């Protein structure tokens, strides 16, 4: 609540990082390389962002990404479509969301219904090259499924602030060239800490 | 013109990268580490962003960063203050700008007046801990001065897409822990390439 904006900002930063590969570019540059072709990226303007979970953080993500000309769609079983309309998010059933999304971001608790919200069945229904963000709770994105999706190219990149186990003991995601990551920094700001 | 949104989008990415140290955090995770204290960051909401150069790219940065609640101030020799106000940028003489800014971003051409726009004189007029972005042209930020300001703490972080020499021959800037960088990727998007 006091940390909604810290979470929402981190999420939007991860979205920009997946579009432009800024973390990977910095690593390259620090290793003395000048790799222009490798880090050809994409524009956010005109892309579709799916927001799973339309509480405080999700809404704050939406209105920030709207300023980039992203089309913002989403799903929340609790929040009315009239409330989500108020902040520019079209609610759609999940089955409709997957095929539309260039980017998908998750803003849910960890429940039975949301553990593996993104899993092999839902990755399959996504547009090829979807990019995924999890700054919410470890386990919302099935980590096995995500790796399989990165391996095939069904998922073109992922940004993870949270893991099923913290620190993650399985390193295959964190080591993947298309994965950007942080050690659960969503609420690690001077402001969130200090009310 | 085509490439203005690519540049503006990178610049905003750089700004969020600087606020939450996302490239350094990924590098630390990739080094097998879980260092959360080290990467305590800052909220963008409420902070002041100084934009030097209020052209197309500068405007586009402003309206995106306005959605994060950033106060947007700036300077441009040509653009009148009532026109900048119409896109949310409060124009002030440079002398007024330096002490006010949490972040500064340059969007100027490279001219005698803008080469070393940021230099030892102007850095010492800044607020301690200012964060700086150059996705415009190498040399607008004097690189020697920026290094000294990073070494003292007067500058808390910088994000560079461009260098006085490309690739950079001098390495101290790129190698600094608080500097994030890319190999001149501001126009390197599929969309910008394609027309
Ligand atoms: C299955 N699922 C998808 C989004 C979402 C949000 C909440 N609050 C609960 C469950 C959810
Ligand atoms: C000295 N200076 C500061 C900002 C700026 C913009 C332009 N286009 C030219 C010169 C400038």
From Swiss-Prot, chains A, B:
Covalent S-S links between cysteines: none
Keywords attached to this entry: Acetylation, Amino-acid biosynthesis, Disease variant, Isopeptide bond, NAD, Oxidoreductase, Phosphoprotein, Serine biosynthesis, Ubl conjugation
Extract one GO cellular component term from the record.
cytosol
Outcome of swapping residue 162 to M: In PHGDHD; results in a four-fold decrease in substrate affinity and a slight increase in maximal enzyme activity with 3-phosphohydroxypyruvate
What upregulates it?
Induced by 17-beta-estradiol (estrogenic ligand) and 4-hydroxytamoxifen (agonist/antagonist ligand). Positively regulated by the transcription factors SP1 and NF-Y.
Q: Has the keyword Nucleotidyltransferase been applied to this entry?
A: no
User: What is the official name of this protein in its record?
Assistant: D-3-phosphoglycerate dehydrogenase
Which organism does this sequence originate in? Homo sapiens (Human)
Shown portion of the whole protein?
Answer: 100 to 294 of 533
């Amino acid at each position: 609540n006091g940390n909604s904006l810290s979470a929402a900002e981190l999420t939007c930063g991860m979205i920009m990082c997946l579009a432009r590969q800024i973390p990977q570019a910095t690593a390259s540059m620090k290793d003395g390389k000048w790799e222009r072709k490798k880090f050809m990226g994409t524009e956010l303007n005109g892309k579709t962002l799916g927001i799973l979970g339309l509480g405080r953080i999700g809404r704050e993500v939406a209105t920030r990404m709207q300023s980039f000309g992203m089309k913002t769609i989403g799903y929340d079983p609790i929040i009315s479509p009239e409330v989500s309309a108020s902040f520019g998010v079209q609610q759609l059933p999940l089955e409709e969301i997957w095929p539309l999304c260039d980017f998908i971001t998750v803003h849910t608790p960890l429940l039975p219904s949301t553990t593996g919200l993104l899993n092999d069945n839902t990755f399959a229904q996504c547009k090829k090259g979807v990019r995924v963000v999890n700054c919410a709770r470890g386990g919302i994105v099935d980590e096995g499924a995500l790796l399989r999706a990165l391996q095939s190219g069904q998922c073109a990149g992922a940004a993870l602030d949270v893991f099923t186990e913290e620190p993650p003991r399985d390193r295959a995601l964190v080591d993947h060239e298309n994965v950007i990551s942080c050690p659960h920094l969503g609420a690690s700001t001077k402001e969130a800490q200090s009310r």
